[PDB]
Amino acid sequence: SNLIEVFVDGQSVMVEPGTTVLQACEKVGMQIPRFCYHERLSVAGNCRMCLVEIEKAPKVVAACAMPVMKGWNILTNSEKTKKAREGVMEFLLANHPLDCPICDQGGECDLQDQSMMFGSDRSRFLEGKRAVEDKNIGPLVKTIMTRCIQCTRCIRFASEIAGVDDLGTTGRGNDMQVGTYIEKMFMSELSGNIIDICPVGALTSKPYAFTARPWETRKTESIDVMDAVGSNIVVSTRTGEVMRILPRMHEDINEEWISDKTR
Amino acid sequence: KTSFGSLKDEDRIFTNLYGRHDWRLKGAQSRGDWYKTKEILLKGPDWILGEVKTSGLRGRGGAGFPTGLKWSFMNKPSDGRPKYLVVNADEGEPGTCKDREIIRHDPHKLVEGCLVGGRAMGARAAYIYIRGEFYNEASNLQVAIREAYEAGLIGKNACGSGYDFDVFVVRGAGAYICGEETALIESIEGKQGKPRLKPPFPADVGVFGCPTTVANVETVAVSPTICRRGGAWFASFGRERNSGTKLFNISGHVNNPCTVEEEMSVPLKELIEKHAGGVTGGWDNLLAVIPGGSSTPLIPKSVCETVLMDFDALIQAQTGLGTAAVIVMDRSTDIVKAIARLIEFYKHESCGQCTPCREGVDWMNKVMARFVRGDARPAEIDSLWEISKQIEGHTICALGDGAAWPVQGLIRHFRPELEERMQRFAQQHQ
Amino acid sequence: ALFVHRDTPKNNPETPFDFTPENYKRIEAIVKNYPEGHKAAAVLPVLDLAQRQNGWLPISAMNKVAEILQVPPMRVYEVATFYTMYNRKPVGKYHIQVCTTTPCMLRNSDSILEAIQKKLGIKVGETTPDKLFTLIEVECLGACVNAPMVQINDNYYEDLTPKDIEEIIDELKAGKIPKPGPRSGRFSCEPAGGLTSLTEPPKGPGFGVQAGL
Amino acid sequence: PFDNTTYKNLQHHDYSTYTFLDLNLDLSKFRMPQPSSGRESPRH
Ligand SMILES: NC(=O)C1=CN([C@@H]2O[C@H](COP(=O)(O)OP(=O)(O)OC[C@H]3O[C@@H](n4cnc5c(N)ncnc54)[C@H](O)[C@@H]3O)[C@@H](O)[C@H]2O)C=CC1
Ligand SMILES: Cc1cc2nc3c(=O)[nH]c(=O)nc-3n(C[C@H](O)[C@H](O)[C@H](O)COP(=O)(O)O)c2cc1C
Ligand code: SF4
Ligand code: SF4
Ligand code: SF4
Ligand code: FES
Ligand code: FES
Ligand SMILES: [K+]
């Protein structure tokens, strides 16, 4: 075979050429923190959360984008990997709004959870945060853009899976806004799935909005009947009442998406 | 040789730097350009690459990567994709105005450099990405390109050598980050000038996904002179691994701000006193010098006394050579206000792609805006240091490095002035 | 300073904009500079061409560039909002851009910014009421040894004093067009107390060309 | 007569707004035939 040997924390693993650092760490059972990487979207590399130390190399690499070279020792838990994660989590939480009680992502937030797991416990940002104009992209997806961390899973999903090309980033620098630039209504057949992949509560479900909260929901694994695809879903209920419908991953059917009628 | 400087006019590459001679083809051929270009193009890519490697030319953009080793990355058989030279003519660096003078006053030297470098790397064409604010310079370069096509020097059967080579000029639209090479490549492709993550380097996937070398105007324009005059000629200047001549842009608090060509390892004091008329108020009036444009850390007057203006000596002076743009700041300078205007520049010129620059350059600008007024406390200084260390090396391109480095230079050489600023704010506002 | 669009009666997708036929020939010349299959690479010049015909970019020039290049309109909106030259609002006929970065601030560009403000009766960002002058404040224009300098629509006006920029504004208000260069004694970028370099004549063809060539 | 005292770059005083683009239109005939990726766009 053409498998190259790399090392994750000293453990040998045989990987295909072209495999990234993140996938090599996944093959030894370690999940690198990420915000913009998504395994069904194109590699962006613009949140810098996956920065990891390769040893004998004085610069961290973006594990979601960097291919492994033969003989690398990926240090997923070293001192400068943790310092990189804390610095990037500090910059993500600098201008992020204190909305966790009134945000629907609370409890099932990637930003909350891997701030608890990989960032620090306190703030140094002594300034005033930014605030972003909200957008009206339709009756399904509520949009609160102050919570946006600009990971561009919006744009990659709408471009590559939904095939729409109507989301994007306007502006430049810290005023860079994810949006449509116009009053445009993002109504695709797969338009609600951006609620899934948005790691923050910038894009939430407008019908699910404010009604429940993820830890109190019971997760019943079930099947879509809205068409003959047979999409695997999670009906999340709460005290004998159906709260919402999430997808299940099935690699051969619905990869991890569902349609808007299903959702 | 131990002392460097005092460069002779016969050893200049950029004759007609000042517009006193004709910039067109009748003037450029009368100064040595487009002479024996066919005999250079017929000796093969390997000879031209060996002349550039032999000359010790390093990248005049400012990183100082070895230009022959860089251009040899393209010397490989094709796979169906075309290959491209792309000449980085953006020049957005505050302090730096040398490539404007190369494009505007020696344009045929740049076009001949495009032809020689594209033959060296097997490139199909040259895309000169000129800054859009350089409109008259771009029309100037297009007139020279039209004169080169009408003389058969480029295009179909370039210089009668059987090599086909176009030269295109693409204008920018007002982004300093479109001088970064991958963001420039994205800007040519009709996109936001957002830098790519490396690898792939542009020699693998560059403009339109082709093999591409992005190279500065100066490091392209000196290459026909390196091929004619020889590699040993250009390597006989400056220190070792510091070979050649260099354009310098001495601006700020000097008597005569100017662009001048000078030998590589010239002293900074000798350069400022000789070509720029010296610091205003005398050399005792000198407070700081930013050696190579805004991205390099400043060095104070104690360092500027004996420092040499090549790459390695300024690295030993814990700064960089950069674009060799000498920004001179005398004792009458609010230096915190100057570095904070510089951080304001770096947050207006930042494409917002990755998190540490998009958030931390704005956060550094807010901390520096409070440091100008002194509306802070000294524990925020080292804090700001750490913020810069969270941006340096954690970004996609080096604009995070170029925005973290002036903060680090200002803290490192002028922490007491920051502290007395803040304590006088404290004693007069409470 | 907004990076969203709202449909006003003077800026909407039914605002009249179309290229002149000579601008279509220029667009064809632009599009033939790029490879086949990469027509999107002509977004930046053509849109700027739409800024040269019109003076500013409504959202009918962006949609027209999106139509004639077969690119999605959001990908033109991104380029129009990313880059600082594209006027998404109607500026005056003379667009004054005063560089105030550190090498121009050291040579007192604030005096010229204040002089343009008190001469035109406006401040930074505003427009004179006769729609002739828009005064904004830009970053490094790459004329640092010719500091302090401004830019008027294509032209660099360099080595300026307040009297020099008042003279330039006066002969802009008189209908003439000034000379784009330094307003001090020197010509382009030389040391102002005479040439410290390139005083010899240039050597010409064949000088120093090595053997074997 | 070796002149070193006059600025020989007086042409850019006479440039208009379409100078660059008219020069591109003039240069459109001298240039080599463009390469093709084999498809009309990456969305084709
Ligand atoms: N000339 C100007 O107007 C400006 C210049 N700069 C300078 O630019 C520099 C940063 O620019 P970058 O190109 O991002 O940094 P630098 O680290 O990457 O690389 C310089 C060149 O070497 C090539 N290179 C480096 N390592 C390579 C490798 N292992 N394999 C293949 N190619 C390799 C890169 O592709 C690039 O073309 C700084 O030194 C800064 O001072 C910054 C702003 C303005
Ligand atoms: C933010 C940023 C801006 C840059 N701007 C320019 C520029 O305007 N002109 C330039 O020649 N190089 C610029 N560079 C350096 C380029 O990335 C690249 O190294 C150079 O253009 C060509 O490499 P060379 O110096 O080896 O020739 C910039 C780099 C960065 C990080
Ligand atoms: S997106 Fe996450 S971190 Fe931000 S307010 Fe909502 S729950 Fe909190
Ligand atoms: S709204 Fe969500 S998915 Fe979209 S770019 Fe922002 S954080 Fe990413
Ligand atoms: S560090 Fe700044 S300049 Fe570089 S890719 Fe990120 S936003 Fe862009
Ligand atoms: S996950 Fe690799 S940078 Fe966003
Ligand atoms: S600083 Fe004003 S032109 Fe460069
Ligand atoms: K979400």
C69 and C106 inside one domain: no
C119 and C173 inside one domain: yes
Experimental approach was: cryo-EM
Bridge partners (DSSP) of residue C133 are: C94
Tokens of residue C84, six digits: 């600082």
Longest CA–CA span in chain C (Å) reads 71
The SS3 of residue A162 is coil
A205 and A219 inside one domain: no
C79 and C122 inside one domain: no
Under a CB-based contact definition with an 8 Å cutoff, are residues A193 and A255 in contact? Answer: no
Tokens of residue B271, six digits: 């350069």
Closest listed residue to residue B268, CA positions, set B294, B307, B220, B230: B307
CA A243 distance to own-chain centroid? 22
Q: Which residue has the tokens 């995070």?
A: B400
C179 and C85 inside one domain: no
Name the pairing type of β-strands B84-89 and A168-170.
unpaired
A175 and A126 inside one domain: yes
Distance CA B216, CA B56 (A): 16
**Residue C107 sits in which domain range?**
91-196
Distance CA B57, CA B69 (A): 10
Under a CB-based contact definition with an 8 Å cutoff, are residues D18 and C153 in contact? Answer: no
C10 lies in a domain? Answer: no
C212 lies in a domain? Answer: no
Nearest Cβ partner for B354 among A47, A83, A84: A47
From the CB of B392, is ligand 2 less than 6 Å away?
no
C118 lies in a domain? Answer: yes
A187 and A158 inside one domain: yes
Q: Which residue has the tokens 């001549």?
A: B245
Tokens of residue B268, six digits: 């900074």
Under a CB-based contact definition with an 8 Å cutoff, are residues B347 and B365 in contact? Answer: yes
Residue B428: burial class (beta carbons within 10 Å; 0-12, 13-18, 19+): exposed
Under a CB-based contact definition with an 8 Å cutoff, are residues B186 and B64 in contact? Answer: no
To one decimal, the resolution in angstroms is 2.6
Dihedral pair phi/psi, residue B369, rounded to 5°: -65, -30
Question: How many domains does chain A contain in total?
Answer: 2
Distance CA C154, CA C171 (A): 16
A224 and A184 inside one domain: no
A82 and A108 inside one domain: yes
Q: How many alpha carbons lie under 13 Å from residue C195 in its C-beta half-sphere?
A: 18
Closest listed residue to residue A199, CA positions, set A263, A121, A160, A147: A147
Q: Of the residues C90, C108, C143, which one is the last residue of a structural domain?
A: C90
Binding-site residues on chain A for chain C (CB distance < 8 A): 133, 135, 165-172, 175-177, 179-183
Q: How far is CA B60 from CA A189, B120, B399, in A?
A: 52, 18, 17
Kindly report the number of other CB atoms within 10 A of residue A57's CB atom. Answer: 12
The SS3 of residue C110 is helix
Question: How many domains does chain C contain in total?
Answer: 2
CA C70 distance to own-chain centroid? 27
Distance CA B283, CA B261 (A): 22
Closest listed residue to residue C144, CA positions, set C162, C136, C156: C156
Q: Which residue has the tokens 């204008």?
A: B171
Closest listed residue to residue B304, CA positions, set B250, B356, B361: B250
Pocket test for ligand 7, best of C96, C107, C141, C158 (most atoms within 8 A of CB): C141
Q: Give the number of the ligand closest to the Cα of residue C159.
A: 7
Under a CB-based contact definition with an 8 Å cutoff, are residues C118 and B69 in contact? Answer: no
Under a CB-based contact definition with an 8 Å cutoff, are residues A149 and A178 in contact? Answer: no
Distance CA A170, CA A176 (A): 6
Contact criterion met (CB < 8 Å) for D32 and B171: no
Kindly report the number of other CB atoms within 10 A of residue B156's CB atom. Answer: 15
Dihedral pair phi/psi, residue A71, rounded to 5°: 95, 5
From the CB of B349, is ligand 2 less than 6 Å away?
no
Distance CA B202, CA B199 (A): 8
Bridge partners (DSSP) of residue B85 are: B126, B213
Q: How far is CA B193 from CA A61, A158, C142, in A?
A: 22, 21, 19
Measured CA angle at B309 (ends B308, B313), to 5 deg: 55
Under a CB-based contact definition with an 8 Å cutoff, are residues B63 and B56 in contact? Answer: no
Long-range contacts of A131-138, Cβ-Cβ distance < 8 Å, separation of 24 or more: A131/A97, A132/A177, A133/A177, A133/C4, A135/A179, A135/A180, A135/C4, A136/A183, A136/A185, A137/A179, A137/A180, A137/A184, A137/A185, A137/A186, A138/A185, A138/A186, A138/A187, A138/A191
Q: Of the residues C43, C61, C90, which one is the last residue of a structural domain?
A: C90
A153 and A222 inside one domain: no
Å from CA of B247 to ligand 7 middle: 17
C98 and C188 inside one domain: yes
Over its C-alpha atoms, chain D yields an Rg (Å, rounded) of 20
Distance CA B303, CA B406 (A): 16
C135 and C111 inside one domain: yes
A168 and A251 inside one domain: no
Q: Give the number of the ligand closest to the Cα of residue A205.
A: 8
A70 and A149 inside one domain: yes
Strand segments (E) across chain C: 94-99, 133-138, 150-152, 155-157
- According to DSSP, residue C36 is labeled B
C95 and C67 inside one domain: no
Å from CA of B322 to ligand 1 middle: 10
End-to-end distance of chain D based on CA atoms, in angstroms? 62
**Residue B149 sits in which domain range?**
25-236
A254 and A146 inside one domain: no
Name the pairing type of β-strands A73-75 and A4-8.
parallel
The SS3 of residue A170 is strand
Q: Of the residues A212, A227, A254, which one is the last residue of a structural domain?
A: A212
Q: Which amino acid is at C82?
A: F
- Does residue C90 have a cis peptide bond before it, meaning omega lies within 30 degrees of 0? no
User: Which H helix or E strand runs over A242?
Assistant: strand A242-247
Distance CA B38, CA B45 (A): 13
Listed in sequence order, the DSSP H helices in C38-72 are 43-54, 61-68
Kindly report the number of other CB atoms within 10 A of residue C122's CB atom. Answer: 18
Contact criterion met (CB < 8 Å) for C78 and B192: yes
- Does residue B257 have a cis peptide bond before it, meaning omega lies within 30 degrees of 0? no
Under a CB-based contact definition with an 8 Å cutoff, are residues C100 and C110 in contact? Answer: yes
From the CB of B112, is ligand 2 less than 6 Å away?
no
Distance CA B100, CA C184 (A): 19
A164 and A117 inside one domain: yes
Q: Of the residues C90, C115, C143, which one is the last residue of a structural domain?
A: C90
CA B396 distance to own-chain centroid? 19
The strand order across the sheet containing C133-138 reads: C133-138, C94-99, C150-152, C155-157
Distance CA B340, CA B337 (A): 5
**Residue A249 sits in which domain range?**
213-263
Kindly identify which residue of chain C lies nearest to residue A159, measuring between CA atoms: C72
C24 and C108 inside one domain: no
Nearest Cβ partner for C154 among D15, D22, D25: D15
A196 and A239 inside one domain: no
The strand order across the sheet containing A11-15 reads: A11-15, A4-8, A73-75, A51-54, A61-62
Q: Of the residues A170, A196, A212, which one is the last residue of a structural domain?
A: A212
Pocket of ligand 6 (CB under 6 A): A 34-37, 45, 47-50, 62, 64
C47 and C136 inside one domain: no
Shortest distance between the Cα of A250 and any Cα of chain B, in A, equals 31
Give the atom of ligand 5 at the shortest distance from the alpha carbon of B349.
3
A202 and A225 inside one domain: no
SS3 of chain B: CCCCCCCCHHHCCCCCCCCCCCCCHHHHHHHCCCCCHHHHHCCCHHHHHHHHHHCCCECCCCCCCEHHHHHCCCCCCCCCCCCEEEEEECCCCCCCCHHHHHHHHCHHHHHHHHHHHHHHCCCCEEEEEECCCCHHHHHHHHHHHHHHHHCCCCECCHHHCCCCEEEEEEECCCCHHHHCHHHHHHHHCCCCCCCCCCCCCCCCCCHHHCCEEEEEHHHHHCHHHHHHHCHHHHHCCCCCCCCCEEEEEEEECECCCEEEEEECCCEHHHHHHHHCCCECCCHHHEEEEECCCCCCCCEECCCCCCCECCHHHHHHCCCCCCCCEEEEEECCCCHHHHHHHHHHHHHHCCCCCCHHHHHHHHHHHHHHHHHHHCCCCCHHHHHHHHHHHCCCCCCCCCHHHHHHHHHHHHHHHHHHHHHHHHHHHHHHHC
Would you call C81 an interface residue with chain A, using a CB distance cutoff of 8 Å? yes
